[PDB]
Amino acid sequence: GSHMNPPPPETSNPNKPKRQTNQLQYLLRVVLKTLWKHQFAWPFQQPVDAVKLNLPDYYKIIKTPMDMGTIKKRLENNYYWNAQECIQDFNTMFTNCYIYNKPGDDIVLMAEALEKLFLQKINELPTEE
Ligand SMILES: NC(=O)c1ccc(I)cc1
Residue range(s) defining the domain that contains residue 94: 22-124
Q: How far is the CA of 43 from the centre of ligand 1 (A)?
A: 5
User: What CATH number is given to the structural domain containing 82?
Assistant: 1.20.920.10
Residue 27 lies in a domain: yes
Distances (CA, A) of 117 to 16, 57, 93, 110: 30, 30, 14, 11
123 phi and psi, to 5 degrees? -60, -25
Residue 1 lies in a domain: no
Residue 8 lies in a domain: no
**Could you give the number of structural domains in the chain?**
1
Residue nearest to atom 1 of ligand 1 (CA): 107
Number of the ligand 1 atom closest to the C-alpha atom of 49 = 6
Residue 99 lies in a domain: yes
CB count within 10 Å of CB 49 equals 13
Residue nearest to atom 4 of ligand 1 (CA): 43
CB count within 10 Å of CB 25 equals 13
Q: Where are the beta strands (DSSP E) in the chain?
A: none
Residue 10 lies in a domain: no
Residue 68 lies in a domain: yes
Residue 11 lies in a domain: no
CB 46 within 8 A of CB 8: no
Residue 7 lies in a domain: no
Q: Is 108 in the pocket of ligand 1 (CB under 6 A)?
A: no
